[PDB]
């Protein structure tokens, strides 16, 4: 029994869609077209949606080392290792499943997703995207600590499971193909090749029809005709970069997606406690930050007079301690309280 | 006769040591652990010390295309090509020999040293290090000129020879290994495998000892025992990231190191002479800098009134020339002198 073999990818397929920059600023019908970039995760993780499907082979089988993309009319297999994500510099890919990629990216103004096909030909899609993720906590750090202050943050979970979030899907539109038509001496010959072809000619007689068998259009030229293969057996993401199917109305399905956004915990480092010296209603701190650290302070009376500054390097701070008291917060550390003697 | 085959690497070995960030902010026992970063060279060259040994194979033979690192209990060979150094972006490696790396790095806040092992697994170590080398001379330039003003500067010489500078070395501590102990039915079996093993059990009888042969601890559990392989045949850098040997006291040796700091000459470009126009006790200069250029001036009388400014782009400067005279220095050029008529 294979009663637990539910595979949504048997119904869906990778596709070709519009990309404004396929390299060198020129637009193309991309097999790695960018659909949507999600940046709701406060931890800085990007949830990227593309036209291809990662971790799935053409036979619908799941294989993490493989990737499937639309090659002209038919989907083809490609290596997962060849897949790359970049902004101003390369990104760290944290998870891949179907149309979705999880990536940790450096600061940038564009977002590029690419891969290398079977023929060793590189394909990429560039979209303008301002990426500069906000700071988690009060300290701008580079690497993730094992221990630190536990702060609330959101991330896209690395779980391959699809249970909460979803996308709209529908049948793809008719796929135009000029190779279906040929010039039989001085007429039009439409060869279906075991497919359902929708044809239309700028000639008399039986000029149109949804055919399953070969058709001939006598007293007609090849340029006067339009031919397209219909796709009623497959599903495709409801993409605004692909036209809607003309035959069916507002017909649509829905499928669950991997990596949903969830509330988690982010560990942040606590800046080293500064060298503190005292004076009459005055506190002097010698700040030695290892990275940008936020310093904030307020009076504990009627007039708090809240002040804040990002400390980048070695700086001596002179603060007035009123009778009511002074509260000082240095980065992710718990607030220090000062009172006059 | 191989009387000139003095090889210090026959006595020394690569090792595993603490690294605060082995990737993603998590700490590990790194085979590429950072020991010390030296930045005394005014030319900006960094002298980096790591736990592994570059240019040496496991059989102690010298091979520049190879690298040796500690793989669990035994040292293993790796490729030199896979070795990398980076700050905010990749560094230019200028020299490698043993525990030492010479690198020219761009501005950064961290320093990362890594490599790729035999199993194609990447290993890296990240330490917080503020790198922003000071300007040599009076002009902030990018590329090294063939001709220019000869200025005194220090560098770490690319010579593989070890004659002046040195490091402290000692025998490594006992290496803990749980695989030495096995459960013989319901007792403890310590298999030495031709090694000197120091063992200790939380049981009666012969619970401890420095054994060269196999030992059995009856009426004892595997969790109640501690086993470690002794290293009295090898030397290791006197690392503060590795514990001292408990048996021997303050016993230590010393070995010469490659790339010592030496006083050399740095060639700097001379900024193009500005377009100079005159007026009554006044000099007007049209500055056209190709890079940040330091402009300085002083009166040649009792009150010099020294003033300086870093000229970034096109700027017209109006300077007053006193009766005593005015001296103007534009970048690395020799000072210009002005006097009223």
């Amino acid at each position: 029994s294979t009663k637990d073999n539910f595979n949504v990818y048997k119904a869906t397929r990778p596709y070709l869609a519009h990309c404004p920059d396929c390299g060198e600023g020129h637009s193309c019908h991309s097999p790695v077209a960018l659909e949507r970039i999600r940046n709701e995760a406060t931890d800085g993780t990007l949830k990227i949606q593309v036209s291809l499907q990662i971790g799935i082979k053409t036979d619908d089988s799941h294989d993490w080392t493989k990737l499937r993309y639309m090659d002209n009319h038919m989907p083809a297999d490609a290596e997962r290792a060849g897949l790359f994500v970049r902004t101003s510099a390369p990104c760290t890919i944290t998870g891949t499943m179907g149309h979705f990629i999880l990536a940790r990216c450096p600061k940038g103004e564009t977002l590029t997703v690419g891969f290398t096909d079977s023929r060793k030909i590189s394909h990429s899609c560039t979209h303008p995207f301002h990426h500069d993720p906000p700071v988690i906590g009060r300290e701008k750090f580079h690497s993730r600590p094992q221990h630190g202050k536990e702060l609330p943050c959101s991330t896209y979970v690395q779980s391959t499971a699809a249970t909460t979030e979803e996308i709209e899907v529908h049948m793809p539109p008719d796929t135009p193909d000029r190779t279906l038509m040929s010039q039989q001496s001085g007429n039009v010959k439409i060869t279906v090749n075991g497919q359902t072809v929708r044809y239309k000619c700028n000639c008399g007689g039986s000029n149109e029809g949804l055919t399953t068998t070969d058709k001939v259009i006598n007293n007609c030229k090849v340029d006067q005709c339009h031919a397209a293969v219909t796709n009623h057996k497959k599903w495709q993401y409801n993409s605004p970069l692909v036209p809607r199917n003309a035959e069916l109305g507002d017909r649509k399905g829905k499928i669950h997606i991997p990596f949903p956004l969830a509330n988690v915990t982010c560990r942040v480092p606590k800046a080293r406690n500064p060298t503190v010296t005292y004076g009459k209603n005055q506190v002097i701190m010698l700040l030695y930050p290892d990275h940008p650290t936020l310093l904030s302070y307020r009076n504990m009376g009627e007039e708090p007079n809240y002040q804040e500054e990002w400390v980048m390097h070695k700086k001596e701070v002179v603060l007035t301690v009123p009778t009511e008291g002074l509260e000082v917060t240095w980065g992710n550390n718990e607030p220090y309280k000062y009172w006059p003697q | 006769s191989t009387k000139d085959n003095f090889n210090v690497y026959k006595a020394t070995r690569p090792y595993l040591a603490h690294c605060p960030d082995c990737g993603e902010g998590h700490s590990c026992h790194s085979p590429v652990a950072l020991e010390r970063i030296r930045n005394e060279a005014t030319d900006g060259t960094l002298k980096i010390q790591v736990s592994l040994q570059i240019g040496i194979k496991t059989d102690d033979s010298h091979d520049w295309t190879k690298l040796r690192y500690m793989d669990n209990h035994m040292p293993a060979d790796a490729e030199r090509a896979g070795l990398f150094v980076r700050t905010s972006a990749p560094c230019t490696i200028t020299g490698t020999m043993g525990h030492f790396i010479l690198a020219r790095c761009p501005k950064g806040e961290t320093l990362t040293v890594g490599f790729t092992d035999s199993r194609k697994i990447s290993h890296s170590c990240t330490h917080p290090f503020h790198h922003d080398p000071p300007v040599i001379g009076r002009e902030k330039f990018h590329s090294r000129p063939q001709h220019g003003k000869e200025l005194p500067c220090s560098t770490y010489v690319q010579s593989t020879a070890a004659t002046t500078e040195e490091i402290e070395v000692h025998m490594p501590p006992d290496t803990p290994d749980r695989t030495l102990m096995s459960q013989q039915s319901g007792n403890v079996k310590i298999t030495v495998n031709g090694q000197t093993v120091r063992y200790k059990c939380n049981c009666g009888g012969s619970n401890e000892g420095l054994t060269t042969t196999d030992k059995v601890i009856n009426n004892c559990k595997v969790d109640q025992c501690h086993a470690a392989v002794t290293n009295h045949k090898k030397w290791q850098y006197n690392s503060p990231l590795v514990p001292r040997n408990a048996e021997l006291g303050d016993r230590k040796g010393k070995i010469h190191i490659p790339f010592p700091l030496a006083n050399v000459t740095c060639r700097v470009p001379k900024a193009r002479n500005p377009t100079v126009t005159y007026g009554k006790n006044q000099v007007i200069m049209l500055l056209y800098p190709d890079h940040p250029t330091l402009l300085s001036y002083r009166n040649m009388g009792e009150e010099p009134n020294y003033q300086e400014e870093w000229v970034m782009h096109k700027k017209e400067v109006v300077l007053t020339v006193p009766t005593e005279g005015l001296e103007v220095t534009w970048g690395n050029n020799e000072p210009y002198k002005y006097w009223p008529q």
Binding site: - | Q146, R272, T275, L286, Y288
Partner: protein, 48 residues
């Protein structure tokens, strides 16, 4: 005016017509001594 252009400024090079064969130039072009054992033509000139 034509023949009055200054180096590194508008008019450092002046051509009466775009088809003109002869042009006026005042770019402060100065040839320098080549580097030891090097074949090259080093020079100093005011930028365009």
């Amino acid at each position: 005016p034509f023949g009055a252009g200054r180096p590194g400024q508008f008019g450092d090079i002046q051509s009466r017509t775009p088809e003109s064969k002869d042009v006026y130039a005042n770019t402060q072009l100065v040839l320098q001594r080549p580097a030891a054992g090097t074949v090259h033509v080093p020079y100093s000139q005011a930028p365009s």
